[PDB]
């Protein structure tokens with residue numbers, strides 16, 4: 001069977017389709033037109049975009065397919081190195097870091113981070129409490145302040161103090177620009193053309209800024225000797241049970257850079273989309289706010305009370321269904337194989353999983369896929385295998401899933417406890433794409449319910 005393919009541009013093939021500031025959303029539109037699979041070609045490379053649970057469940061078979069570094073991730077690898085996110089499965093440092101860090105990211109480990117997560121969450125609530133009447137909130141911006149601060153504090157005992165600033169930390173200016181430069185190199189023609197001398201000079205300056213600041217944080221912790229229980233202490237002391245080896249300082253830096261990218265980009269988006277959907281669906285907002293008031297009976301929320309917020313968890317999973325903030329991941333065929341009993345693949349052939357389209361698969365979810373209904377995630381066992389993949393697949397799934405969800409559930413619980421929300425502008429959804437998705441310009445007013453902290 002001949003594989004569907006979108007419109008070509010002569011010798012440039014399909015590559016000019018990505019020359020747009022919303023490539024994922026364009027690929028989603030192409031998927032609606034062409035269906036469950038389509039071919040995508042650029043000069044000297046090819047991949048296949050998958051959109052149905054039927055094909056993606058086979059793609060998620062770890063005996064047949066393994067994580068591939070997409071072109072974007074290969075560019076991100078120039079500053080994320082061989083950290084967990086940008087390393088190949090067969091690289092020694094992946095399995096080492098994975099075995100070392102798994103216990104630090106578990107559900108039990110969240111009991112340890114909870115205190116510091118509340119520290120930052122209280123700073124968000126107090127900011128909003130202290131706004132004057134008729135002032136508004138810039139939601140993505142404020143969620144990013146929170147999520148960046150939380151990973152900095154919980155991870156490496158470093159306070160970015162984003163709620164004390166308008167202009168971001170020097171690390172973040174370099175990190176955001178490096179990610180932008182990684183994204184812009186996908187849409188580019190010729191690399192060594194000296195017209196991009198300033199692009200390369202900035203990118204190398206941004207690498208050095210991230211490396212120097214993070215390497216200083218490693219050396220300062222080593223020289224201190226103090227044992228503040230966090231990601232950095234676990235990495236300096238911990239040993240891989242398999243090889244018996246620790247991570248060296250170069251890899252540790254890459255893991256820290258990786259966690260800062262993660263805790264900045266994806267996690268704030270989840271909270272942003274979640275609040276968007278809540279203000280656009282007042283009955284769902286009502287249910288979640290009712291739970292928050294009933295469950296969060298103390299001024300300082302405990303770990304147990306965050307686990308008790310079941311409906312707030314359902315709200316977040318439905319936000320992850322409609323707009324998964326890390327919307328695509330790449331795979332490659334380990335051997336020759338046949339996908340879906342009709343698409344023969346050779347060893348090394350690549351696949352892209354388009355997660356927003358998987359999450360709109362009508363044969364799994366029904367015909368109302370665009371509606372925001374948290375009741376879909378009432379029973380987690382009711383969701384078929386590989387139907388809901390906002391945190392990726394298998395051994396290369398998101399190590400920060402429990403961190404992200406605990407943080408988002410705590411913060412969204414507290415937000416719903418302490419405020420009523422107004423969509424005062426009648427905000428029209430406008431999704432800006434970088435590494436991740438964000439509702440750009442999403443604003444609300446938060447009127448206080450006047451419950452003390």
Ligand code: HEM
Pocket residue numbers: 067084085086098151258259262263266267268270324325326328329330390391392393395396397398399400401403404
């Ligand atoms: C809403 C929040 C988040 C989402 C939607 C998300 C999504 C994902 C996805 C889809 C992957 C798989 C990438 C691939 O297959 O190429 C992944 C990997 C990863 N994420 Fe996240 N993530 C989130 C938050 C976090 C946080 C907070 C951290 C760390 C503090 C984190 C750390 C990682 C790491 C290290 C990997 C690489 C795992 C490995 O291959 O060993 N993520 N994430």
